[PDB]
């Protein structure tokens, strides 16, 4: 029920950023894992896919789905975003509230290259 | 006296009933009456024909009715002009549907059925025809 409730909770924000057409930094946390991307303004193509399911990220972090791993993923994804040349995004908390793993990962992205 | 318990609104437009109708086929009973033409069936007329069919069948069988005087027409009580707004509610009818079965009969022979439907022609000003339920 959590997934459907969260998707309905996030429909307004996700459609808002899709229609605004500013490329949005997307998150979706789970208790055990998490996947972090950078998605196109309309949503038809991603830019960088970095997650705690990757080999190096998984083996360099003691626990996959925890806030410390979320912060490490934020650092890594924003630095790879700088490497590819990503500068401007408009945040999308994806229906959650801006606190916890999402807040720490977002602060990591701010430090490591994304302006928000 | 067939008449609604309540209507949507007290008056309604005079209305239109042109073209072809939809009550083409028979639905409930063995023997029916067709009216190819066009007119109106008053509530008094519908009740009278029902009573007369009961008279003829001697309470053998059942009677069925499709159209209803759900539309309270406003005619104008005599000696009043076109003006003064719309007229006043006076009575209830249903209009004539080409192909419609109006009154239905069962349990009695075809001869008595045509007799009673000619008597419907003699208690109504509407053109008639004798119909029965169709095979599929």
């Amino acid at each position: 029920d959590k997934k459907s409730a969260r998707i309905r909770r996030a429909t307004r924000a996700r459609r808002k950023l899709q229609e605004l057409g500013a490329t949005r930094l997307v998150v979706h946390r789970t208790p055990r894992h998490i996947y972090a991307q950078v998605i196109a303004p309309n949503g038809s193509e991603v830019l960088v896919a970095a997650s705690t399911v990757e080999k190096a990220i998984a083996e360099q972090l003691k626990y996959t789905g925890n806030k410390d791993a979320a912060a490490a993923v934020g650092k890594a994804v924003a630095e790879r975003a700088l490497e590819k040349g990503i500068k401007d995004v408009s945040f999308d908390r994806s229906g959650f509230q801006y606190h916890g793993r999402v807040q720490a990962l977002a602060d990591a992205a701010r430090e490591a290259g994304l302006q928000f | 006296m067939l008449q609604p318990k309540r209507t949507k609104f007290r008056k309604m437009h005079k209305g239109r009933n042109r073209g072809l109708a939809q009550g083409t086929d028979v639905s409930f009973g063995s023997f029916g009456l067709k009216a190819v033409g066009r007119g109106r069936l008053t509530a008094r007329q519908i009740e009278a024909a029902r009573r007369a069919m009961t008279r003829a069948v001697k309470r053998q069988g059942k009677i069925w009715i499709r159209v209803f005087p759900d539309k309270p027409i406003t005619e104008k009580p005599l000696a009043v002009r076109m003006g003064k707004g719309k007229g006043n509610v006076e009575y209830w009818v249903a209009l004539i549907q080409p192909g419609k079965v109006l009154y239905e009969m069962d349990g009695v022979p075809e001869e008595l059925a045509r007799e009673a439907f000619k008597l419907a022609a003699a208690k109504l000003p509407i053109k008639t025809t004798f119909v029965t339920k169709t095979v599929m």
Binding site: - | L20, Q22, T24, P98, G99, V135, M136
Partner: protein
């Protein structure tokens, strides 16, 4: 078992139907399953008399269209709203 003489209606349409009803002809269509749809024009009073039988919507009839027997059966019907005319008669192949 009725063997009915019917032809192929080249052009259909409402004006075609009006002129065919003037010239005593009413249509019908052959169909059923995967076969190609073909439609025919019928002999009016012949069809009325043959379907006055109780076995018309039950038995396996036979249709002569362009010199061939076709085995079909009844599926559905449409009728003139206020006249004894069968607006349509329907065939499922046997």
């Amino acid at each position: 078992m009725f063997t009915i003489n019917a032809e192929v209606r080249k052009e259909q349409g409402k004006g075609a139907s009006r002129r065919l009803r003037a010239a005593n002809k009413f249509p019908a269509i052959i169909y059923g399953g995967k076969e190609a749809p073909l439609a025919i024009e019928l002999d009016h009073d012949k069809v009325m008399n043959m379907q006055a039988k109780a076995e018309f919507y039950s038995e396996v009839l036979t249709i002569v269209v362009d010199g061939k027997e076709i085995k079909v059966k009844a599926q559905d019907v449409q009728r003139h709203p206020y006249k004894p005319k069968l607006q349509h008669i329907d065939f499922v192949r046997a």
